[PDB]
Amino acid sequence: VEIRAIENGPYEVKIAIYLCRCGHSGSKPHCDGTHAKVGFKAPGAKIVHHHHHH
Amino acid sequence: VEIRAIENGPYEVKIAIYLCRCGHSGSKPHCDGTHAKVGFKAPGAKIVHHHHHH
Ligand code: FES
Ligand code: FES
């Protein structure tokens, strides 16, 4: 399981789904690209990289 | 691994961390409670409940 924040965009959750973090998606909790229109800014970040066996 | 959206609040990721989804945390990507001050609204939702062995 990998979770990262995309720069100026959604969370990517890979087990891929994209979760809104700007607050303005028309289809919460899934990102629909509204982040770009509202001018959301936040840097990329690694958040979790979990192997269940470790 | 469990990921859920909290009503009017953050994503909860349990392997617990809380990820901002309103866009306005002072400590992105982590929730700091700003969602309540800005009046963010979104319902609760189950998103993933993954067992690596299944
Ligand atoms: S982060 Fe993409 S619509 Fe909100
Ligand atoms: S969801 Fe809590 S500060 Fe944004």
Numbering used by the authors:
A (entry chain A), B (entry chain A): 3 to 17, 21 to 59
What text appears in the publication on this structure?
Like other single-motif type 1 and 4 CISDs, the 53-residue type 3 PcCISD also adopts a dimeric structure with each subunit binding a [2Fe-2S] cluster. The dimerization buries a surface area of 705 Å2 for each monomer. Each subunit comprises four β-strands (β1 to β4) and one α-helix (α1) arranged in the order β1-β2-β3-α1-β4. The iron-sulfur binding module is located between β3 and α1 and coordinates a [2Fe-2S] cluster with residues Cys25, Cys27, Cys36 and His40. The β-strands from one subunit form an antiparallel four-stranded β-sheet that further associates with its counterpart from the other subunit into an intermolecular β-sandwich. The PcCISD structure closely resembles the RsCISD structure, but displays a permutated topology. The two structures are superimposable by both subunits with a root mean square deviation (rmsd) of 0.562 Å over 83 Cα pairs. They also share similar dimer interfaces, including buried arginine residues and water molecules between the two iron-sulfur binding modules. The β3 and β4 strands of RsCISD are replaced by a short disordered loop in the PcCISD structure; nevertheless, the position of the strand β3 of RsCISD is occupied by the C-terminal β4 strand of PcCISD coming from the opposite direction. Another difference between the two structures is that the β-sandwich of RsCISD contains the subunit-swapped β-strands β3 and β4, but there is no strand swapping in the PcCISD structure.
The recently discovered CDGSH iron-sulfur domains (CISDs) are characterized by one or two highly conserved 17-residue CDGSH motifs with a consensus sequence of [ΦCXCXX(S/T)XXXPΦCDG(S/T/A)H], where Φ and X are a hydrophobic or any residue, respectively. The [2Fe-2S] cluster is coordinated with three cysteine residues and one histidine residue in the CDGSH motif. We synthesized genes for a type 3 CISD (PcCISD) from Pyrobaculum calidifontis, which is a hyperthermophilic archaeon, a type 4 CISD (RsCISD) from Ralstonia solanacearum, which is a soil-born plant pathogenic bacterium, and a type 6 CISD (MmCISD) from Magnetospirillum magneticum, which is an aquatic alphabacterium that utilizes iron reduction to derive energy. The four CISD structures display striking similarity in their overall appearance, with dual iron-sulfur binding modules and a β-sandwich dimerization module.
